[PDB]
Structures are given as C-alpha cells and as structure tokens.
C-alpha cells in the first residue's frame, strides 16, 4: 500500500529528473553535420546449405569466421571469404533460437526452446565438434547468449531472467532477475563489465556483471523489445522493438536520444547492430528488407533487399568491413 | 589459383554439402507435429499410446512415415514470442480432456477449464502463423466424461446449451463448439477424435489426418489447389 504508492512517487521523481536534464533535442544538435547520403551495399557472398529457417548469426573477431543457427539442427561455421563451410555441428534439439561465437574462437554456443545452452569445443584434439558443456536451469526459452570469455557467458531466457554462467563449473554464478517480461536479446559492452538486456515489457535494463544488480531501466518503447546492441564506445545502445521504431538510449543521459520511425513500414525489428564508427545503424526488419539508419541525421542511408523471407538476424563484423544478414529463406548474404 | 589447402578446404565444404542435403531430404520426409493443450489434458497419456524441461520430442514410425511430435507444455514463457517458430509444421495435435467442465482452476479467481481451453484453441486456430495448418483435435477422458455427465449436467456450468442431458448429444455439442471457433474453415480442417485409452486407432487417426495434409501440400505443389 504505502510501499507501492512510494514506488509511484519515486518513478515520477525519475520522470522529473529526465525532463529536467533534457534541454536540447538530439536532432536539433546534429543538424550541423551533413547527411551521409545514399549508401549502396552490394551482395558479395551468398551462403547456401542451411535448408531451414535461420535465426541467429555471430561474427568472429578475426572478421572472417561466422557461426549460424538453422532449424535443421545444424550450426554451420562459415568461411566468409571463400564461401566454404568450416564446421557443421549436429544439434540434439532442432529448435535453436540463438548462437554465439567466442572471442578467442575456441567455443560456440547455441540455445533455444530446449532451455539448454550448449557449448561446443572447436579446437579439440579429436577433430569433431563435440559438446563441452550443457548449461541447464532456465525455465524459459533461450533467446540470446554472448561469450564474455572461454569460461564465462551471459544467456537471456524466456523466464524473465538473465544469468552469468561458469562454463567449467556448469552452474550459474550470478542470476539477473527483475524483468516483468520475457527477455529477448542481450549485447556485451566492449569492456564486458556491463550488459543491457531488452525484455517483452518494452524495457531495456542495464546490468552489471560483477555486482549483479540493475543499474538503469529504460522504458521508451511501446509493446515489446526483440533486439539490442551497444554503441561501439560503450555508452549508448540502440534498441529494436515490434512497433516499427528503433530507439537510442544513453547510459549516462538516461533518456531516449533518438527514435527511428518511418511511416510506410509498420512491421517489427528482429535485429540491430552498429558500424565500426557507429554512424550507421543497420536494422533487420520484417518487410524482407534491411534499412541502414544514420545514427545522427535520423534518415535512411541505404536499403538492403533480396531476402525472400524476413531477416531474422544481423551482425556487423569487428573491423567493420562486412555485414551479414540472415533470413528465413536459408540464405546468408554478406553486404559490403 | 587455389592453394593446396584451399582446394582441400573447398573439398571439405563439398563433403559437408553432401551431408547437409542428405539430412535436409531426410528432414523433409519426416512429418513434424505440434502437441498443444492444457497440462491435465493427457499429453503424457496420448504420447505413450502412440509409442506402444523444454521440448519433449517423440519419434514414432507408422506405415513408413516418420513422425515428430513436439511437446511444448513444459515452458512457462509467453507463447506469442516463440509461436512463430512452428510455422512450417504439418499439423497441430491439440488435446483437451472432456471431463474438465466439472474441474475448477487453481487460480483463486473463478474460471472454467472449458472456457480456458476454448481460449487456448482460439489463439492457436486464429493465429497468423497457423493459417494453412490443420488442427488434429483430441477430446480426451470420454469415459470419465460419460460418468460425470449422468451425475452432473452440462447446462449448469453455462446456460447457453439447452439440449437434453445425453452423452452422445453433449460430446457432439462440445465437438462443434471448438469447430465454431475456427474463423477460416475453407483452408483449415479440424480433425476430431474421441479417445479413452484407445489403441492404434489413435495412431491411425493421426496418420489419416496427416495423409490429407500431405495431399493438401502435394495439390498445392501441383498447383491445382
């Protein structure tokens, strides 16, 4: 009674602090900078052989290897330059909604409707990609996972909970709880000390890895959040939702910096990512097209086409050379 | 042009291409079925009839046709966000128990299991991801329904049904009420079968319903339909 009414007063105090801290709209400030203009990207490689619905991809840190998750029960690790397949990992559960590639390149994660995060060792002496660790103890479907290290990984799940996993021990060290809705995506910051996770209550919550508590909560979006990606410096993050908008939140400013709403597109956003500079925001949509959004001019720098079905996933590589977008038509297409 | 490793690297990729296409052709032949319903419906029962955390996958082979049954009842999460995964499925096996009208829900607020199951069927049947997918409806526990309907009428739980207290009439009435929830009847069939611990007839029913879906797919494949 008194507690919950105090929470309403504290929430209004935060709304007061947000309105007070804001004086100048971001679109007014960035008017001086010239627009990037039409940015045309041509297909460079088309990756074939999935034969099923792709859900996730993740780049390697060498900017050449990438893993991809398909619904035939096969994780495929790709040589992006020569179109060759590096590994084909047979999965026990065909329903896999995410995949991660370790920064060292040793391990590969996947997760989905089986509620099990499976870690796959690539540099084993036997030469076949075998299961190193099966992480269990989520009540909901895994939607996203990213390697902090060869021993640490943060996974998002459909039980409104994120968790920090010890791969060698096999149990969750830090449990991140507090989401009112099911978490759908996570992104690691470059320092990997903090991460932010968007859930189905239209909220994006900043989490601290070492402490284990929620530092900040962002409630700009309307319906529910599907994607989230950090800005390259580590202070901002654009967030993709299912209301045809992409919103940019700053950790320090604690406000929505910019919104990306265009009229004729009413469909949702599956995946977002940033370029190497951060000037381009590339968002996968459901209208079979990837739109390139300028970070500061709030325009459409470019449009990627050629996908039969909706683009499930989109990651921009480490150096920033290429962009590979995965769609539900079993084709990965690399855009440079 | 290609170095000695690069030719072997392409050769490794071609062998993987051979392995994936064999698994892809095998997966296309295999029939995928989605298992839905309440927890007390008898999902556990009907799986055991056909054999004899996360996804429970059931593999059974009837008349040279491989079946995959995916039980999703263990998940507590919101279904709307992961229901898009099962778009390319052959049929929906939706099981409910007929004796649940009498039963009272765990939640404190008054509610009806039949009314929960109809809303459970309504979101599945009218789903945008399940428009071309037929639903294989199972109505379970009819022997327990037969005993309960003599003692306790169907008229008491909702006044709308004015039919006489007959076992055959009530079971037929509950059958069409699920079928009345279908809003696209031309492109979606509802296959209803009354099950009370039945033998291979349950497997035969599923096989008969799946056979028409394969006809529906092949006729679309031919272009005539």
């Amino acid at each position: 009674d008194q507690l919950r009414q105090e929470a309403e007063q504290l929430k209004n105090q935060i709304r007061d602090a947000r309105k007070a801290c804001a004086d100048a709209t971001l679109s007014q400030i960035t008017n001086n900078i010239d627009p990037v203009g039409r940015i045309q990207m041509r297909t460079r490689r088309t990756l074939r052989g999935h034969l099923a619905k792709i859900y996730a991809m993740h780049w390697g840190t060498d900017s050449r290897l990438l893993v991809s998750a398909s619904q035939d029960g096969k994780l495929i690790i790709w040589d992006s330059y020569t179109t060759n397949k590096v590994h084909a990992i047979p999965l026990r559960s065909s329903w896999v909604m995410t995949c991660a590639y370790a920064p060292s390149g040793n391990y590969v994660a996947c997760g989905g409707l089986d509620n099990i995060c499976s870690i796959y060792n690539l540099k084993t002496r036997e030469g076949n990609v075998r299961v190193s660790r099966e992480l269990a103890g989520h009540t909901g479907y895994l939607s996203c996972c990213r390697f902090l290290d060869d021993n640490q990984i943060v996974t998002s799940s459909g039980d409104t909970t994120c968790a920090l996993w010890d791969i060698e021990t096999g149990q969750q060290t830090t449990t991140f709880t507090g989401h009112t809705g099911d978490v759908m995506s996570l992104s690691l910051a470059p320092d990997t000390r903090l991460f932010v996770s968007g859930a189905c209550d239209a909220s994006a919550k900043l989490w601290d890895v070492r402490e284990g508590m929620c530092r900040q909560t962002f409630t700009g979006h309307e319906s529910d959040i599907n994607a989230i990606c950090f800005f390259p410096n580590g202070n901002a993050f654009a967030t993709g939702s299912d209301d045809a908008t992409c919103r940019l939140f700053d950790l320090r400013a604690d406000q929505e910096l910019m919104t990306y709403s265009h009229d004729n597109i009413i469909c949702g956003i599956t995946s977002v990512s940033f370029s190497k500079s951060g000037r381009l925001l590339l968002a996968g949509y459901d209208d079979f097209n990837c739109n390139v959004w300028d970070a500061l001019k709030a325009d459409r720098a470019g449009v990627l086409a050629g996908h039969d079905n909706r683009v499930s996933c989109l990651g921009v590589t480490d150096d920033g050379m290429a962009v590979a977008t995965g769609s539900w038509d079993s084709f990965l297409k690399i855009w440079n | 042009t290609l170095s000695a490793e690069d030719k072997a690297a392409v050769e490794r990729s071609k062998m993987i291409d051979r392995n994936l296409r064999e698994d892809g052709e095998k997966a296309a032949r295999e029939v995928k079925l989605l298992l839905l319903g309440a927890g007390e419906s008898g999902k556990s029962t009907i799986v055991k009839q056909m054999k004899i955390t996360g996804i429970v996958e059931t593999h059974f082979t009837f008349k040279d046709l491989h079946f995959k049954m995916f039980d999703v009842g263990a998940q507590r999460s919101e279904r709307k966000k992961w229901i898009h995964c099962f778009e390319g499925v052959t049929a929906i096996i939706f099981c409910v128990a007929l004796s649940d009208y009498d039963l009272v829900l765990a939640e404190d607020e008054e509610m009806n299991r039949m009314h929960e199951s109809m809303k459970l069927f309504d979101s599945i049947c009218n789903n945008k991801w399940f428009t071309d997918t037929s639903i294989i409806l199972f109505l379970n526990k009819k022997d327990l329904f037969e005993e309960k309907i003599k003692k306790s009428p169907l008229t008491i739980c909702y006044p709308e049904y004015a039919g006489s207290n007959t076992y055959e009439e009530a079971a037929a009435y509950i059958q069409c009420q699920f079928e009345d929830l279908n809003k696209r009847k031309d492109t979606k069939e509802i296959y209803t079968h009354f099950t009370c611990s039945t033998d291979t007839k349950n497997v035969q029913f599923v096989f008969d319903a799946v056979t028409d879906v394969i006809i529906k797919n092949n006729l679309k494949d031919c272009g005539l339909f």
Epitope: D79, V86 | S3
Partner: single-chain antibody
Framework: VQLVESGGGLVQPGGSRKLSCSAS????????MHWVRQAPEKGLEWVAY????????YYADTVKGRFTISRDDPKNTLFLQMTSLRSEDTAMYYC??????????????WGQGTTLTVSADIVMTQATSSVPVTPGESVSISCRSS???????????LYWFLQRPGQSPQLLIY???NLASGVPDRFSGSGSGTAFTLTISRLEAEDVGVYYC?????????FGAGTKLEL
C-alpha cells in the same frame, strides 16, 4: 589420439606388401591421411596423400604408379598397397592426420613408424646441417625455398617439424606463424618467401633434435634436409 603402423619386416625387392595403420581416439573419416618416409641416414620425404572421403589422391613423381593408397572409414584403417618395391624404399613409413580448414592445424599428429628393409617442384634448402648449441642461448634455424611460398590470400605454407632421436616427428609451427597445440611459446617462426627463420628463446634439453622445413604450396610435398642440434 593414437596411430600405430603394422606390416614391416624384410621385403624382397619387387615383392608386394600391404601396410595398415589403425586409428584410435579421433574421427578418422574427417582427416586427410599422409604417408611420409624417412631414410635411416637421410631426412624426411613425402609419399602419398588421400583426402577425407577419398575425393583426391596425390603422389610424388618418384613414387607414382608403384604405390597405392586407400582408406576405410567404417574400420578406421589406412591401407598402403605397395607393388614392385625397389632398393630406395628402405625407409620408415609414418601415418599423418591432417584436417584442412581456415585456422586448422594439419600435420599435427604423426604415427609411430613401421621399419621397412629391402635387401638387394619446390626444393627446400637447409643452410647448416648441424650447429652445436648450449642450453640457454637463442638458436637461429633458417630454411630457404626454391619458390616464393607467399600465396595471394596471405597464407605462407611452411611447417616446422621437430624429430627427437628415437621418437616420432612432431609439429611445432604451422603456416610459419602459428604455434601448434602443445608447443611452448619459446618457438617462433618468421620470414617471407624464399627466406625463413626459426627461433628458440630459451633452449631446453628436450628441444634437441632434427628440425625439418616443409612447403605446402603445391604437390608433391618436399621436406628439408633437416638441422641437428647437439649439446
């Protein structure tokens, strides 16, 4: 992971002998398989290669036709069929597993070797046959090539093998810059086409042995003469 060879002994010249190497502890069907021979008082020499799935087969020009290589994936055994063995084939034959992909480490595990006694093209060059060394000093080992091994993709295919006396040769550095699994950080390879360098930071007694250089730009594969360290 273990490879053991069988089928040795004394063979009459012009006779026939069929070697078999049994593989244990690794997925045999996914590795390509090499035969490498070593004369008793000379360096290594490549014989034959069969790929995974038997898709391609390569031989050296001096062993072409007489030797037959096959493999059986369900039984995990590599078969070498030999016809009309001559007096130059008195060498110990090794089995080698080699996986090939971007970032792979081929030639990583070598077999034990089967002694065979008979009783009657890029050329890698070694500057020095044998340099005496002491533990604790840097050891510069240099191999030179008859052709620039720098391919257009940026991968220079040089392999540094160490063969300790009475032991199988082991991979140290693959593709001239990458350390194999189990190799200490002290070993380090550098250079470019036609000029290569091998260095050891802090020499140990177990590092003593014969150091081979092998190009892998085009077939046939050619080993160096080797460099021997002594204490």
């Amino acid at each position: 992971v273990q490879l053991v060879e069988s089928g040795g002994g004394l063979v009459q010249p012009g006779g026939s002998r069929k070697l078999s190497c049994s593989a244990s502890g690794f997925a045999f069907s996914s590795f390509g398989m090499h035969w490498v021979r070593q004369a008793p008082e000379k360096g290594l020499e490549w014989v034959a290669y069969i790929s995974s799935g038997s898709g391609t087969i390569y031989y050296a020009d001096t062993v072409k036709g007489r030797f037959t290589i096959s493999r059986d994936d369900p039984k995990n055994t590599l078969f070498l069929q030999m016809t009309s063995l001559r007096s130059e084939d008195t060498a110990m034959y090794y089995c080698v597993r080699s996986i090939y992909y971007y970032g792979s480490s081929p030639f990583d595990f070598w077999g034990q070797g089967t002694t065979l006694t008979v009783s009657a093209d890029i050329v890698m060059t070694q500057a020095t046959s044998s340099v005496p060394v002491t533990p604790g000093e840097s050891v510069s080992i240099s191999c030179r090539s008859s052709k620039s091994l720098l391919h257009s993709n940026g991968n220079t295919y040089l392999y540094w093998f160490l063969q300790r006396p009475g032991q199988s040769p082991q991979l140290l550095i693959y593709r001239m810059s990458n350390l194999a699994s189990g190799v200490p950080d002290r070993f380090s390879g550098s250079g470019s086409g036609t000029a290569f360098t091998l260095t050891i930071s802090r020499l140990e007694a177990e590092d003593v042995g014969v150091y081979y250089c092998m190009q892998h730009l085009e077939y046939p594969l050619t080993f160096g003469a080797g460099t021997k360290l002594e204490l």
